[PDB]
Structures are given as C-alpha cells and as structure tokens.
Design a binder for this molecule. Structure first.
Ligand SMILES: [Zn+2]
Lengths: 15, 627, 143, 84, 82, 96, 96, 37
C-alpha cells in the first residue's frame, strides 16, 4: 500500500 | 466535594455568571476555597475551571471571580492538548497559550505568574511565543519577566519563535536585545531552528542582529542545517554572511543538491542535477587552488558509484534518474557523515520508492544500510525492522525469492536492537516506560514476522545455521511481553498482532514452522506467562481448530515432543484439557498425553490441598506447583 | 525410613558409594542389594535438606572418575609391551562401568544434570577421552 | 523398539493412503470381519500409527489389497496366494 | 457401470464448481446481466471443463433457492443477492 | 482381561487373565512363578474355597469389578492347608 | 519375565517385567551388576518406600500397561488422600 | 473461515450456517432447531 506514503527532539519542541 | 466541583466547572465552561454565583455561595470558607483552587478531571486530563474559562475566551466569569473572591492563578495543571499534556504548568501558562490577551492581563492584574517555573521551567512567555501573539508577549515582558529562562534542555523562547512561523514574536524578542548566541542541549543555536522550517524572514531578522554561525553538536552549521532540509532560500541568505568561504559554500550547494534528490515534500531531480553542477562548476572554476572532491570509498548500498569528481561524468548522469538519486545519497553521506541523525531518512525514502516500483534487491541493500547507520547511532529502529518485515512479506506474497544473507542481517539487527530495547526498559523506570514497552512488544512481533519469513524461504545450510544461531541468541535472553508471553507464546497465540500492511499475507499466528524453529533453537517449552498459561495452554484455546487443522496439529506435536507438560496448571489451576474449550484440541491433546504416576499423584496432592512444603524434594515442589 | 528429605552426612554416604562404584567400574562382583541400596543413597544425596547435595556429589564422582582414569593411564603406560591389550581390556571394563554408572546415577541425570552440565555416562566417557586417549594418542595411533 | 518382544508372523506391507486425495472410498458398506490370524498386525499398526502419526483414523480397505494362503488343512499342495 | 458413475461423479463436481464460480463473480460487482454472467463464468471455467448453457442456467436456479443469488425486482435480467 | 492380586502372607502377585477361563492355568502360572509343587495352592476369595474347574469370572469378581485398579483380595495358601494369615499393607502415616 | 519388588516393611510384590520396566529407576536397577538372571525372580529391595505405596505403584504399572494407548475414556486412578504426597515421592524416585 | 458446530453434532461453515439460519431455523439434513455452541 505505497511504502513511500507510509513513511513519516519531541521533548525539545515542547514550549 | 467533587460533584459540586464538576458543577462549577460546567458553569464556568459556558462563561456564565449567575450560575457560578449560585453554585459558589451558601457554604463555609474552606470548601469554597477548595472549589476555586482545585482541578476537575475531564477527558482524562485535569484542568482548573479557570483553565476552561480562559480556553473558551470567557474572561468575564474569571474577572468577576477575581472581583468577588481572592482566587489565584498558581494552580498546577496541564500544558496544552496538542500532544504534550504534561502537568506542572500554572493557569496563566495556558491562559497565554490559549491566545486570549484580556484574560492574561486580568490574571496579571491580580497575582501575576509571569515567572512561573514548571518541571520544564517554562514561563507563560513560552506558551505566548508558541501561540504567536505580539500583545501577550509585550505585556508579559512589561510585567517584569526575565526572557532568558533557559530550560534543562535550554529551549529559549527565541528558539521556539524561530522554529514556528511567527516572525513578529521573534522580531520583538530581538528588539529587546536578547541573546542570539543561545546554546541548546543539542548545540542548536537559534538559526538552526530558524533555517529548519524554511522561514526566510526570521533568518533575515536574526542575521540583522548578527546571530552568528556556530557548529552545533551534530556537526552541522545553520547553513548545512538549511541545505539538509531542501530549503534553498535560507541557504541563499546564509551564503551571503560576508564570511562564508568556498569550502562551506560548495559543500552547502552539494548538500542542497543531495537533499533535493530524496525527499517527500521537495523532490526535484532537475534541481538535484543543477545544484550539483553549480557546485562542481564553482569547484573547478579557476584551475588554481582548485578544490577537488575528497571522494569517500564506494558503498555497495548505493550501487557501486564513486561520486562525481568531474563535470563530464555529472553531465553524463544528467538524464539517468536512479544514478542521480544514488549520487545525491552518496554526496549527502559524505557531507553529513555516517553518524548524523538525518542522514538515514532519505536512504529509507529511496528504499521505499524502489519497493513501490517492485525493485526489491536494491531496496533491501539501501534499507540495510540505513539500519546499520541507525544502529551505529544507537537509535530506535523498531519501525525499520517492521519495514523489513513488510517488504519481505511483499516478495513472498509476490512469489519472489528472498536472499538468505539479507534475512540473516536483519535478524541479527533485530536481536541486537531487542537487546538494547531490554536495556532501555530496564534503565527507564517511569519516564517514557510505556513507549519503551510498546517498542519492545513491537520489536518482538517484528522478530516473529522475520522468523516466519525465514521459514518460508529456502536457505543454504550455513545461512540457516546462522539464522538459527540468531534465534538461539534471542531465546537465551528470555524476551517477555507485558503479560509474560515469551517468544514461543506469541508464535503460539492467535491474538498476536500482525501488522495491517503486507505482513498479513505471509505472517499468520499460530504458525507451525515458527514454533518448530523456536523449539529447535531451544525455546523454553514449559515457560509460563504472567497468568501461568504455558505454550500448550494457549494453543488449545485456539478458536479455529478445523480451518487450519494442519497448523494446529503440527504445533501440538512439536510442543509435546519438545517436552511440554500436557497436564500442568496455570495460576487458576486449570489443566489445558479443561482450558481446551474445543473438542478437536481436546482430542489431539488426549491422543498426545503420556500418562505418569507422578502427574496423577501431584494432581491428587493439589486437589486435596495437602501441605507439601518441606515434605518433598525441592525439585518436586515445582512439580506440585504446576501439576 | 522413608523417602523424606533428611539431613544426611555426605562423608559416609560418599564413602560407601565410592566403594560400590569403584567395584562397578572395575567390574568386581558387587552385591545387588547393595546396588539398590546405593540407588536409594543417590536419591538421598540429590534431595537432602537444607541444600541439595547434587553438585557436591557430581563433583566428587567427577574427581573419582578422573583419578581412576589416571590410574588406568599410568598402568597402561607402564605396560609398554602390551599397551594395546591393556587398553582394550580397560576400555571394555570402563565402558561397562560407564554404562552401569549412567544407570546408577539416573536421578542426577534426570533431575539435576538436565535441569549446562553433562550426564554421568557422558562424564565418564569425556574423562576417559581427555585422560586416557588424549595423553597417549600418538603411541596408540603408531601402535 | 517396543519394550516387549513382539513377533507378528507377517512380513507386513501396507500402503497408507490419503482419504480425500485417492478415489477409492468406503461407499459400499462391506462389513468385513478382520481375520483372527492377521488381527494382531492391524491392532498394533493402529497402535503404531496413532502413536507416531497421531490424530489420524484408518479406514482399512480389504478389497484392494492381496494376501497369501496357508494350506495346513489341505495338505500343502504347491504354493497359492490370492486377494485377502 | 463404474465408467458411467465416474462420468456422473464429475457432473456433481462441476455443479459445485459452477456454483462456486457464479458466487465468486457475484461478489465482485454484485450485479450483472443474465447474458453477461454466462460468458463470464465460461471464461473463468475454461482451463477445466467447458460448461454448457443449459447447466449454468440450472445452477442459477439452484443458487436462487439457496438464496445466494436472486433476480432484481426492477429488472429480472439483473441478478442481486440476499 | 480380569486382574487379580494373589496374596500369601507378605508375598503379592499381580496377574492378568481372561473373563471366561478356569483356575487351572492360574494355579499353573503361580506354580511357574513361585517355584514350588502345584497341588498345594488353594485360592480363597474373601476366605472361601472355590472350584478348580469353575471360571473365575463367575466366582464373584468380574472385569467390571476387578479393574487395573484395586483388583481383588484373593488369598493364597500352601498345604504343609496353611492358616490364612494374609498380612495387610502398612498403615499410612497420620497426616496433619 | 516376572520381577519381585520387596518393600521396606517385608512385603514382596511380584509383577511382570514388561509391567515393571515402565518406570525408569526399576529399569536401571534391573540392569547393571547383580541383574540376577534367574528369569523368574529378579528381586529388588526398596528399603525406603512402604508397602502401600509400592502396592499402588504396582497397580499403576498394570494400569499403564493396560491403558498405554487405548480407551480414550480413561478411567480415573484412585489416589487416596492419605497415600498422596507419599506416592508422589515414590513415583519421583521410580521416575514413573 | 470459522467452523460453527451444532447441538445435534452438526458442524458446517460459519457463512453457510448464517445464511441457512437466515432462511430457516431447521437443520439441512434432519428436522431439528439450530443452535450454536
Ligand atoms: Zn443438525
């Protein structure tokens, strides 16, 4: 089902 | 009382006055103070009634609450519902984060909390900068609040202003003579966040204030950070810093051409060739003090190319698209090294593009290289192993051969990363232990998918021995899920999640080949979960005894032949014959049972509740324990 | 008595066991009531409170097998002319002794060894290999 | 391999057949009583086959298999063998 | 006699294959014309026996009684399911 | 397939036999396994003599009663007949 | 063909060798030196297990030989409450 | 697919049994009311 479309610091981007 | 607290929360949610006035009077002092100073739990999140008053722009109700009472804004609550939901923040924090100026100014007018410090020591100015309203930031700094509040990971408000598209907030912050050379935990100093989202005006604003260029922790200048993310305009602006040097300029142009080759949002192959050619022409422009390419040794993953050290070969690879993709990958690898965070993702994207075009072997090579880089960097690769499980299950469903060394390599990587996931779960107590637990369970499931794929692929004796060695190595760590399931139990269970992608076509649990392979590799056939159910207790509860009776038969034969107890009981004292819940499984197990006087005697001991402690051999106490 | 796990002295039990197992290995006519009594002695040793003596019994019978094989090694080495005949006779005797030892030590094999370690018959064969054909491999091959 | 010493008196030869694959079936009733002299083989092969190839039920077909004849009552004239 | 019943054993076998083929087609588009379905089931059951027009017509009537297929109320030529 | 527990003082023998068969071969097999002359064996079913030609299925015990579990209290005596002094099994210890 | 199982308290139990080789420890005791190949006695001395538990393991030997693989409606084997935890230790010693 | 049994030792396919009980609550071979397990 389109491997390319299936692709996709979190604590640092918090305010 | 919690009920009247919910009542006044509902009254303040609609922004009404008379309802709250009638619901917050005719009582004593302490209960009313508790009502106005406690949070209500809605939607799984705790929040002050002042939070829901400020979030809906209902400033009149909280204004009259401040007039009629002495309510404070210092109540501990959540931060924001957009994927953070961590507690410790004050009411003024979310009031600034709600984008409502008047509620902020009235909360400042009575008991200002501009210098609030949470567990992340984030002031309400942080949320004001995140929202992007000039008036709130201006008033909050005018309330004598320090703007140099660095976090534990050193996230200045200027950094989150630069990361977001709010140029007004950052220009007002730099108008106040703020620090532009603000070091962070990862080394990213303002411009690294600014030239990551492609905000040209913000980068211009900070270059006007001379934010300066400094290499961060990951060995990336703001210019290289900009070129890494295909943002050409900020690359242009940073290339005119009046101190840039040739080597940096050409490496930035090469990095930009590399990044344009493999990206989802910004994919132009003509821009790839043109920027690579611009950097090559600017390299070989003079003939004196020439800057020749320090070409890395060839990598088997990107074919066998050796970059492009001449403009003639770059000209010859102009119209050949996959050669340009590989060339961009190799020059990106050269510029950002083999140890950067973002060097691995374009490799994965090119692998995904190759897989979508049914070009599988080069896809496997690229994804294996990305896996090796991510494991050298010690990063969470539970998504990459699942990606291998999906593509391997796509060749088998398409009747395509899978290379045995590739399966061995991904299995070794899976075993090692499960070792590090066990270490992560052990080390982390409760910081993000749920995420680590889910990653661990997902890694176990992906290992099972890879083993199931390995069973259906014909391999040589040496490669099969290496695969069995990897499975053996994982078995002798005893990997367990949340509910005590060992690696054998999940291959036996029917509730084991198989991923909704192409893995459904090849990976079906229970699987007789996976169970036989695990038992041959030394799986503890008598191992128990948290409920006490062994591997035999779960196969009997299988609810499709006739549709795949060939599968159900062979796994019970393998389990009994490996040495499972056909009689032992779980924590609820339930023999698998009693827990069979199926006539067919009961018949198979009764056929496979071997009778022993030890089992009957121990069952009689357990049924009659005879005190057996310190009256039997120590090795027999366990036998009474499960029989 | 009974099969109840009881505190048993290791010295006298191991002494009578050592006498009967050297009689078994050397194929001397041992009383069969003694043979069954020493099955019971093996069970008593592998079970006794407060700590099972399975590890100590395994180590002690390993030491006994080692020094008996060493004694046979010295005898076959000093029998220079009839090294082959002496090795054949001692190999027959020790193979029968190892099989009967795996019979006598069945409780260790099925309750301690397999619950890693390696069985008593396998231990006797390994000791015979390492101390009885490994040292004089060259002279036996040349002979 | 059996613990006790067993002699069948028969050089046993059997062709075990898949039920659904093969076209021969038990569509006629054919209630045939197994001969007592060879009943030891069929009461031990089923003991053998359920022990090894467990969960399989054998429907013996007698009219598609042969046998040999002993002539103790006749006086042993020559050697004869026909279908079982 | 044995040759005759084996020629009749496949008759029951091909009726089960015709019913399976008709249902398999009827779950892909859920409606087809009566004449359009006959040519479709012949094309699928072509590596095996060639089904006669009279046999497939009988298999439709049997499947109607089995409620796997039913003629549409708006048009009897169109075939629905229930 | 009747089962029997032939007892004589301490000695006990577990024996398989058929439903419809005489005690002649029973006496012959206990003769073979006891190594003694055959004529002195006399079987008692709850201390009463039984016929030497009568089948043991009709004697008072059958395959439904004499199972592979506790078969029968069949006593045996030898003519010097000896007095029936069948020793019982040891009493189980007093459980807590 | 017939082996003799002397209990601790004097009682002698005689069961078939085929019946008594279903336990590993008795199979090991019969093998080795002192097999005493008289073909009819093959005595073994169980100086530890009492008479009732030895009787019960002999009944179990007969029971297992009869029901080794047959009679899917397997009858229950009647372990008394007072004989359990002493038949369990006996079965562990005998490796039944 | 899944196999559905019956109180009269009648085991068939789940979809077939579901359609049959949608038609009538009678076994397809005898006359007895259908039930699950
Ligand atoms: Zn029915």
């Amino acid at each position: 089902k389109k491997h390319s479309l299936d692709l996709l610091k979190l604590r640092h981007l918090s305010p | 009382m919690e009920g009247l607290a919910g009542y006044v929360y509902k009254a303040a949610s609609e922004g009404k006055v008379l309802t709250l006035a009638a619901l917050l009077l005719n009582r004593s002092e302490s209960d009313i103070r508790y009502l106005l100073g406690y949070v209500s739990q809605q939607g799984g999140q705790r929040s002050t009634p002042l939070i829901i008053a400020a979030r809906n722009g209902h400033a009149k109700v909280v204004r009259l609450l401040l007039e009629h009472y002495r309510v404070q804004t210092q109540q501990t609550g959540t931060v924001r519902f957009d994927g953070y939901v961590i507690d410790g923040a004050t009411a003024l924090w979310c009031a600034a984060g709600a984008g409502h100026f008047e509620v902020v100014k009235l909360l400042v007018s009575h008991g200002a909390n501009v210098n609030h410090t949470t567990v992340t020591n984030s002031t309400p100015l942080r949320a004001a900068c995140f929202d992007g309203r000039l008036d709130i930031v201006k008033y909050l700094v005018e309330n004598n609040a320090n703007i140099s509040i660095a976090n534990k990971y050193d996230n200045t408000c200027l950094m989150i202003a630069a990361y977001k598209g709010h140029t007004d907030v950052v220009r007002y912050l730099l108008e106040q003579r703020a620090d532009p050379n603000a070091k962070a935990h990862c080394g990213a100093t303002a411009l690294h966040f600014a030239a990551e989202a492609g905000h040209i005006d913000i980068v211009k604003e900070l270059i006007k204030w001379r934010a300066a260029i400094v290499v961060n922790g990951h060995g990336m200048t703001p210019l290289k950070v900009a070129a890494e993310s295909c943002k050409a305009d900020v690359v242009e602006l940073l290339l005119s810093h009046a101190d840039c040097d040739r080597r940096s300029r050409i490496e930035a142009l090469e990095l930009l051409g590399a990044s344009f080759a493999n990206d989802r949002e910004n994919y132009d192959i003509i821009k790839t060739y043109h920027y690579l050619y611009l950097a090559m022409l600017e390299r070989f422009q003079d003939g004196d003090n020439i800057l020749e390419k320090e070409v890395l040794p060839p990598i088997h993953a990107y074919g066998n190319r050796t970059e492009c050290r001449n403009p003639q070969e770059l000209e010859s690879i102009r119209q050949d698209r996959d050669a340009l993709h590989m060339e961009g990958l190799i020059v990106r690898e050269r510029i950002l090294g083999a140890d950067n965070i973002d060097v691995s993702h374009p490799i994965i994207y090119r692998g995904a593009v190759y897989a979508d075009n049914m070009e599988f072997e080069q896809c496997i090579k690229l994804w294996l290289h990305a896996l090796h880089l991510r494991q050298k960097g010690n990063r969470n690769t539970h998504k990459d192993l699942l990606r291998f499980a999906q593509v391997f299950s796509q060749m088998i469903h398409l009747n395509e051969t899978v290379k045995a060394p590739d399966i061995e390599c991904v299995l070794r990587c899976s075993v090692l990363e499960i070792e590090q996931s066990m270490n992560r779960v052990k080390n982390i107590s409760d910081a993000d232990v749920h995420n680590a637990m889910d990653n661990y369970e997902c890694n176990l499931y992906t290992f099972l998918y890879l083993v199931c794929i390995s069973t259906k692929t014909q391999c040589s004796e040496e490669d099969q021995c290496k695969i069995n060695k990897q499975i053996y190595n994982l078995i002798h760590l005893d990997p367990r899920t949340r509910e005590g399931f060992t690696l054998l139990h999940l291959a036996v269970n029917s509730n084991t999640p198989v991923d909704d992608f192409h893995t459904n076509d090849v990976c079906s649990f229970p699987n007789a080949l996976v169970t036989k392979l695990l038992l041959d590799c030394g799986a503890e056939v008598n191992a128990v979960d948290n409920e006490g159910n062994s591997a035999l207790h779960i196969i009997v509860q299988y609810n499709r005894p006739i549709s795949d009776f060939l599968t159900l038969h062979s796994i019970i034969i393998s389990l009994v032949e490996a040495g499972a107890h056909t009689d032992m009981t779980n924590k609820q004292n339930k023999t698998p014959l009693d827990k069979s819940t199926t006539g067919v499984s009961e018949i198979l197990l009764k056929t496979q049972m071997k009778m022993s006087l030890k089992c009957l005697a121990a069952r009689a001991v357990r049924a009659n509740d005879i005190n057996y402690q310190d009256q039997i051999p120590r090795t027999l106490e366990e036998f009474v324990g499960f029989h | 008595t009974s099969l109840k796990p009881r505190v048993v002295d290791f010295d006298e039990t191991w002494n009578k066991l050592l006498t009967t197992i050297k009689a078994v290995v050397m194929l001397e006519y041992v009383e069969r009531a003694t043979w069954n009594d020493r099955f019971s002695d093996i069970y008593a040793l592998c079970v006794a409170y407060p700590e099972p003596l399975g590890e100590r019994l395994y180590t002690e019978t390993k030491i006994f097998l080692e020094n008996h094989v060493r004694h046979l090694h010295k005898r076959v080495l000093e029998s220079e002319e009839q090294v082959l005949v002496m090795y054949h006779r001692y190999w027959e005797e020790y193979s029968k002794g190892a099989d009967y030892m795996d019979c006598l030590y069945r409780y260790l094999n099925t309750q301690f060894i397999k619950k890693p370690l390696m069985e008593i018959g396998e231990l006797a064969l390994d000791m015979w290999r390492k101390l009885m054909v490994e040292p004089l491999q060259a002279i036996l091959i040349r002979m | 391999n059996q613990d006790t010493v067993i002699d069948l008196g028969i050089s046993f030869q059997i062709y075990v057949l898949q039920a659904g694959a093969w076209p021969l079936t038990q569509a006629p009733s054919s209630t045939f009583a197994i001969p007592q002299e060879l009943e030891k083989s069929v009461q031990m092969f089923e003991l053998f086959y359920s022990q090894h190839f467990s969960g399989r039920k054998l429907t013996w077909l007698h009219y598609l298999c042969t046998g040999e004849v002993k002539m103790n009552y006749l006086g042993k004239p020559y050697v004869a063998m026909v279908t079982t | 006699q044995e040759m005759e019943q084996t020629r009749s054993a496949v008759d029951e076998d091909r009726k089960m294959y015709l019913q399976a083929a008709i249902v398999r087609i009827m779950k892909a588009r859920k409606v087809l014309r009566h004449n359009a379905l006959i040519q479709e089931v012949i094309s699928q059951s072509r590596a095996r026996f060639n089904p006669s027009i009279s046999m497939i017509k009988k298999c439709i009537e049997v499947l109607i009684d089995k409620q796997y297929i039913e003629r549409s109320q708006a048009s009897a030529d169109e075939y629905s399911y229930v | 397939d009747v089962f029997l527990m032939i007892r004589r003082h301490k000695t006990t023998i577990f024996t398989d036999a058929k439903e419809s068969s005489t005690v002649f071969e029973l006496k012959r097999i206990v003769e073979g396994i006891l190594k003694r002359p055959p004529d002195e064996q006399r079987l008692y079913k709850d201390d009463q003599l039984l016929d030497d030609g009568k089948t043991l299925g009709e004697c008072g015990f059958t395959s439904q009663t004499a199972r592979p579990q506790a078969p029968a209290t069949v006593g045996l005596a030898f003519r010097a007949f000896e007095a029936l002094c069948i020793e019982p099994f040891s009493s189980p210890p007093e459980l807590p | 063909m017939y082996v003799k199982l002397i209990s601790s308290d004097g009682h002698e139990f005689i069961v078939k060798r085929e019946h008594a080789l279903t336990s590993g420890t008795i199979k090991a005791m019969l093998s080795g030196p002192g097999q005493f190949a008289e073909n009819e006695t093959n005595e073994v001395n169980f100086r530890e297990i009492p008479s009732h538990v030895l009787s019960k393991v002999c009944m179990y030997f007969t029971y297992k030989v009869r029901y080794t693989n047959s009679s899917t409606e397997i009858p229950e084997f009647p372990i008394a409450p007072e004989i359990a935890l002493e038949l369990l230790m006996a079965a562990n010693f005998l490796d039944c | 697919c899944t196999v559905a049994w019956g109180v009269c030792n009648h085991a068939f396919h789940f979809h077939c049994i579901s359609r049959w009980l949608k038609t009538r609550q009678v076994c397809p071979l005898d006359n007895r009311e259908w039930e699950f397990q």
